[PDB]
Design a protein around this nucleic acid. Structure first.
Lengths: 94, 109, 98, 81, 97, 85, 109, 94
DNA sequence: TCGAGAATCCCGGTGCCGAGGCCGCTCAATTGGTCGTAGACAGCTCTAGCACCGCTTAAACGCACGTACGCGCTGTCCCCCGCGTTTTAACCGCCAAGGGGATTACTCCCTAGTCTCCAGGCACGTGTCAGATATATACATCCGA
DNA sequence: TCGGATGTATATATCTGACACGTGCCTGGAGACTAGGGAGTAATCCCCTTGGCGGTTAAAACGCGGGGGACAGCGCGTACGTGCGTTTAAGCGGTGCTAGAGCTGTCTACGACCAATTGAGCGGCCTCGGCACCGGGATTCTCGA
C-alpha cells in the first residue's frame, strides 16, 4: 500500500510556537496544506521564467529573492526578504 | 569513521524541511540545475508566511471562546487583513462563510 | 388583535442570521440529480466520487453569492432597493463574462 | 435517464443565497434568470472535468479532476486536495 | 452666425476618432511623466525609445476600455453625462478596488 | 544635467482626456471627471513601472528595454502584441 | 552512400518547420523526453490557426481597396469573429483602434 | 554579430496560398510573430502539466490533442484536431 | 413616550467521538569522493541615448452666451412581504452486490546520445510601385423660416 | 417643406521610401547506429459506489390581505457645449558627445552522480475532554396607543 506525504507535521510545530495552548481541526489542516502547495508553485514558476529571460541554466537564491519581490505585496515582501537572507547566512557560517 | 548525521534544516535554524524542498525543486522541471542556497531561502519564506496566518487565526478563535482552529477562523483572519486579502484575492475557502456587511441605505430610519 | 411585523423587518433579521453561519443552503439530493443530468451530454455511464459532488456544490454557492453582492450595488446606483434582471445583466457584462 | 432537474433549485433556496449576499427586496422575475446563470456555470466546469477523466482512461470523476478544472478558470478552491 | 445645436458636434467627433488609429496624447509631456515616476524606484535611469512607445500604447488602451464601462453605468441610471461615481462603480466591479 | 522633475501630471490636458472619451463613445462629460482620470492613470503607471525596474535590476543593467515592459504587462494580465516577444 | 536528405516537414505535407519546433520543445523544460509525433501534431495546429486569421484579414484589406495588410485589418478580422474574439480576449494590438459602436439612446430623435 | 530567428518566412508562404496577390507590412508581420509565440507557449504549458498529473515523463501526440481540446473554443477545436490527426498519419505512412 | 409580545442571549448538565499521543519500521536524506562545465571577470568596440538650438504653426487657453439636462416634489397603483394551513419529499439507518481502481511482473520498442555532412535560412544590397499628399469639386446633412 | 451653409466623399496628378527579391555563406538539421529503461499488458484483490426499503418530520407550496416602493409627470435653474481671439510649446531638422550594451577568451569552484548507512516520518491503534445539544429563565427590540 502506497503512502503519501504532507506538511501536517511541520505546520503543527509552527503553531506550538506562536500559540502554545491551541489546537486545530482536520478540516483546517487540509486548508493549510493547500495554501503551502499553492505558494510554492507560484514562486518556483516565476523563478523558472527569470532564468530563461537571462539565458541562465541554474536557479539560485538570487532568482528566489527577485521572485518574492514580484509576488508579495508591500510590507509582506520586506519581512520575507530579511527572513530569507538571515537563514542563508546562518547556514553558510556553519 | 563517519560523523554523526545532521539535518540541513537544523543548520539553518528552521522548522520546514530543506531536504524535501530540494527534491521537489529538482523533479519539477523548473531548470537544469539547482543551487545550494535556493532550497534554504525558499523554506524560510514558506515558514514565515505560515506563522503570519496562524497567529491571526488563533486570535480569532480565542475571540469567540474556542480552543481549536476551524475553517471559519481562517477566513476571518484573511479577509480582515489588507495584504493577506490581496495575496489571496482569487481563492475560495470551503466552509468559510462571508464577512457581516449591510449597506447603509438598507437600514431603517 | 394579532401581531404582524412591518415589511422589511423580517428580511433584515434573515440577513444577519445567514451572514453568520457557514452551512450549505441548497438541498443535497436535488443538486446531485442536476449534476448527473448535465454530464450525460458529454459521456455515458459515468460515476462520481462522493467528495467530487461536494466540491462542485461548494464552488457553485460561492459563485452565486458573489454575483448577488455585485447585483445589489448596481440596483442602489439607480436609487432602488429591489434587484431586477437588468441589474444581473449589467454586472455580468462589466465582469467580462459576456 | 433524468429530465427537468433545474426546477429542484427552488425559490426558497434562491432567497437564502441572496440573503447571504445582503439583498433586501427581490423581484419576481429573478428566479428564472438565476437558474439560467447557474446552468451555464456548471456546463463549463463539468466539461473540463470529464476531459481530464478521459485522458487518464477512467470511468469515475474524482475530486482532483474538479479541482484542476476550477483552477484552469481562475477559481482556485482550498480544502479538497 | 450658424451655431450648431448642443450635442451635434459631439456625435461628429465620436465618428471621427472611432475610425482612426493614431495616439491621442502628446508625446513629449507623456515622456516627462514616465521619467518622474521612475526616479522614485531608482536614480539615473535611461530608457530605450521603443520602451516609452510601448508604455503609451498600453496606457491609452487601458483608459479607452474604462470609458466604455463608465458610459454603461451612467445609462443604467437614466443619464447621458458621466460622473465620478460612475467611474468608481466600474472599477469596483472589475475588482481593481 | 540631472535636474529633477515635478508637477508633470498636469501635462495630460483637458482636451486630451476629451479625445480619449470620444473613442470610447461618450457624449457629455461633467467637470470633475478630469481630476479623477489623472489619479487613475497615475496608479496604473506606478504598478507597471515598478515591475519593469525589478526586471532591469536583476539583469544588472542601467537601461529599461522594451522587453522589460512587455514582461511586466503580461504578468498583470494585459498582454501586448507588436513590440517583440 | 547516404540517401538524399529530406525535411521532416515535407514528409508531413506542412509549411511550418517540424525540426525547429522539436528543438524548442526539448530546450523549454517541459518534460524529460519528447515523443516523435508531438512536433508534427503541434506544427499542424499552428499552421491551421495562421491560415484562419490571414484569410479574414485579407478580406478586410480588399474591402477598403488596399493591397497590403496593416494592423488595423488584423484587428477588424479578430473582433468581428465570435470564436477568435474569445480566444484573444485579453490581448491588445498596437495601432489597432476600436470597432465603431454608438449606443442607441445617444442618437438624436 | 549574433543573428536572430523568426517565423516570417513561414507566415509569408501561408499567405501566398490563401491570397496569391496580397502583401503585408512589417508592422503587421511583427504582430503575427507575437501571435504564434503566444499560442505555442499556451499549448506546451498545458501539456506539460498533464504529464505531471498522470505521473508520466514523456510528452506525446496524445497530450497535445488533449491540450488543444482544453484551450480552443467550439468549432475551432474540432477543425484543429482533424488537421493534426491527418498530418501524423501521413508522416507515419512514409 | 410607554406596556405587551416575540426573538435572542446566557447558563447549567450530559454524553460522545475526534484530536493528540505512542510504537514499529522502511525508505529517503546524509556523508564522503570525483570530475567536467557554467558562470565570473577583464578587455575592447561601436550603437544609441541624451543634450542643445532655431523656427513654424497647430494646439491649448481664456471668455461669453444660452439651452437642455439633472434634480426635487406629487400622486397612484399594483407587486411583493408576512403569516397560517396543508402536502411532499429529503434525510436517516441499514442491507447487499459487484464494477472498477490500484498494485505487481515481465518484456520490448522507442528515445537519447555521437558523428559526419550539406542545404535551408539569415544578413546585406538594390530598384520600383503602392500609398500619401494637395487641389478642385459633387453631394449629403443640419437648421431656421 | 425648402433653401442656405457647412462638412465630407470622390477623382486626378506627383513623388518617395519600404517592400520584395537576389546573393553569399555558415550552422543547425538530417542520416545511420547503439544501448537501456519507460510504458504497455495481463492478472488479481478488495473498496467504495450504486440501488432499495421504511419511518419521521421539516421544508415546500398555496392563498390572502395590505403597505410602500416604482414609476410617470411637471417646473426650475445652473452647468456644460459651441464658437471666437490670443498665447504657448510641441515637432522637426540638424550637431555633437560619451555611457554603456554586447561580444570574446581564460580559468576555477560548484553542482551532478554514485555507494553505504541510519533515523525521521508514516500507518495503525487507543483514550479522554472540547464541543454539541437540550431545557429553562433573563433581556432586548419592535409596534401600537
Amino acid at each position: 500500500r502506497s503512502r503519501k506525504e504532507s506538511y501536517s507535521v511541520y505546520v503543527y510545530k509552527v503553531l506550538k510556537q506562536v500559540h502554545p495552548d491551541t489546537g486545530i481541526s482536520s478540516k483546517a489542516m487540509g486548508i493549510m496544506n493547500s495554501f503551502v502547495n499553492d505558494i510554492f508553485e507560484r514562486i518556483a514558476g516565476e523563478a523558472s521564467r527569470l532564468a530563461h529571460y537571462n539565458k541562465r541554466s541554474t536557479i539560485t537564491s538570487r532568482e528566489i529573492q527577485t521572485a518574492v519581490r514580484l509576488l508579495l505585496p508591500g510590507e509582506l515582501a520586506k519581512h520575507a526578504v530579511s527572513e530569507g537572507t538571515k537563514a542563508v547566512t546562518k547556514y553558510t557560517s556553519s | 569513521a563517519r560523523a554523526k548525521a545532521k539535518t540541513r534544516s537544523s543548520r539553518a535554524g528552521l522548522q520546514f524541511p530543506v531536504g524535501r524542498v530540494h527534491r521537489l525543486l529538482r523533479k519539477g522541471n523548473y531548470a537544469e540545475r539547482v543551487g545550494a542556497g535556493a532550497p534554504v531561502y525558499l523554506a524560510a519564506v514558506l515558514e514565515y508566511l505560515t506563522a503570519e496566518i496562524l497567529e491571526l487565526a488563533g486570535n480569532a478563535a480565542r475571540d469567540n471562546k474556542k480552543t481549536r482552529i476551524i475553517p471559519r477562523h481562517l477566513q476571518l483572519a484573511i479577509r480582515n487583513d489588507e495584504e493577506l486579502n490581496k495575496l489571496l484575492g482569487k481563492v475560495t475557502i470551503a466552509q468559510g462563510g462571508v464577512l457581516p456587511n449591510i449597506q447603509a441605505v438598507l437600514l431603517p430610519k | 388583535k394579532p401581531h404582524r411585523y412591518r415589511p422589511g423587518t423580517v428580511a433584515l433579521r434573515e440577513i444577519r442570521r445567514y451572514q453568520k453561519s457557514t452551512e450549505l443552503l441548497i438541498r443535497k439530493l436535488p443538486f446531485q440529480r442536476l449534476v448527473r443530468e448535465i454530464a450525460q451530454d458529454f459521456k455515458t455511464d459515468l460515476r462520481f466520487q462522493s467528495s467530487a459532488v461536494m466540491a462542485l456544490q461548494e464552488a457553485s454557492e460561492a459563485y452565486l453569492v458573489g454575483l448577488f453582492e455585485d447585483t445589489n450595488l448596481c440596483a442602489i446606483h439607480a436609487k432602488r432597493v429591489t434587484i431586477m434582471p437588468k441589474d444581473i445583466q449589467l454586472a455580468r457584462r462589466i465582469r467580462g463574462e459576456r | 435517464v433524468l429530465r427537468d432537474n433545474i426546477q429542484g433549485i427552488t425559490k426558497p433556496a434562491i432567497r437564502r443565497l441572496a440573503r447571504r449576499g445582503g439583498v433586501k427586496r427581490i423581484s419576481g422575475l429573478i428566479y428564472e434568470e438565476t437558474r439560467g446563470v447557474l446552468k451555464v456555470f456548471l456546463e463549463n466546469v463539468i466539461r473540463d472535468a470529464v476531459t481530464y477523466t478521459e485522458h487518464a482512461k477512467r470511468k469515475t470523476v474524482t475530486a482532483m479532476d474538479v479541482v484542476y478544472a476550477l483552477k484552469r478558470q481562475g477559481r482556485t478552491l482550498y480544502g479538497f486536495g
